[PDB]
Every structure is written in structure tokens, then in C-alpha cells.
Amino acid sequence: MAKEFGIPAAVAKTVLNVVEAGGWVTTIVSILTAVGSGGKSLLAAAGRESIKAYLKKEIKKKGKRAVIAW
Amino acid sequence: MAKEFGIPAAVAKTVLNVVEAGGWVTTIVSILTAVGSGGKSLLAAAGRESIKAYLKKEIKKKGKRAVIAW
Numbered sequence: 001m002a003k004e005f006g007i008p009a010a011v012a013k014t015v016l017n018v019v020e021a022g023g024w025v026t027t028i029v030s031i032l033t034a035v036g037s038g039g040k041s042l043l044a045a046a047g048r049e050s051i052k053a054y055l056k057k058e059i060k061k062k063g064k065r066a067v068i069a070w
Numbered sequence: 071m072a073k074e075f076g077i078p079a080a081v082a083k084t085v086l087n088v089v090e091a092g093g094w095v096t097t098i099v100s101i102l103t104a105v106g107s108g109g110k111s112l113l114a115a116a117g118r119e120s121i122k123a124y125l126k127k128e129i130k131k132k133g134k135r136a137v138i139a140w
Binding site: 008011013014015017024027034036039 | 076080083101104105106
């Protein structure tokens with residue numbers, strides 16, 4: 001998330017914790033909106049998929065630490 | 071929130087928007103908990119006072135920008 005979108009690690013970590021806790025897609029959207037254009041770019045990258053489902057797949061594949069870094 | 075509790079600004083903004091919208095204490099709790107230790111510490115700083123009421127009072131005292139900053 002940092003490398004590809006410029007998202008601060010602490011923001012990215014919060015987002016992924018929300019995902020893992022079964023938190024709301026709406027919350028995730030709000031936090032990525034608030035981080036600015038890089039967050040909006042990630043939201044757009046999910047495309048037709050929910051951002052939550054998109055990020056859950058990435059976490060399952062690569063682990064949280066790597067998704068944060070990405 | 072950012073300087074005293076390490077709540078990233080994007081997350082802090084999201085939290086204050088929930089507060090302003092009159093959203094749920096449980097949602098404020100889960101977002102702050104997702105931040106990690108600094109979020110948990112902000113929750114502890116509120117004591118027995120509703121986190122929502124607590125942050126509303128902080129906004130009344132300092133304004134939204136300064137609450138985010140803190």
C-alpha cells in the first residue's frame with residue numbers, strides 16, 4: 001500500500017486491522033478517502049470488487065506486513 | 071490525536087466524522103482499537119465518559135483541526 005499508493009504505514013495497518021476484525025466496508029472506504037488521492041487510487045483499483053474483499057485476498061496471499069508495504 | 075496518541079490524521083478525521091454524524095461508540099472504539107496501542111490509549115484517556123461525548127467536548131474546546139492534531 002505504501003509503495004504502490006503512497007499510503008502511510010500506520011493508515012494501512014489500521015485499514016487492514018479493520019478488515020481482519022470484520023469491520024465495515026464503509027469504514028474502510030472512509031479511511032482510504034481521508035488519506036487522499038492515493039487512497040482513492042487504491043479504492044479505484046479494487047474495481048467491481050469490494051475494497052474489503054480485495055484487501056482480504058491480498059492479506060491471505062501475502063500477509064499483513066507485505067500488504068502494508070505494498 | 072496525531073501527536074499525543076499517534077492516531078494517523080486520516081483515521082482521526084474518519085473518527086471525528088463519526089462523532090459529528092452521531093455514529094456509534096462501538097464503531098469509534100473498533101476504529102481506534104484497529105490503530106493499535108495509541109488508539110487504545112485514547113480510549114483509556116476518556117475514562118468512563120463516552121468516547122463520542124469526550125471527543126465532542128474536545129472539538130468544542132479546540133476545533134476539529136486541533137483535535138486531529140492532538
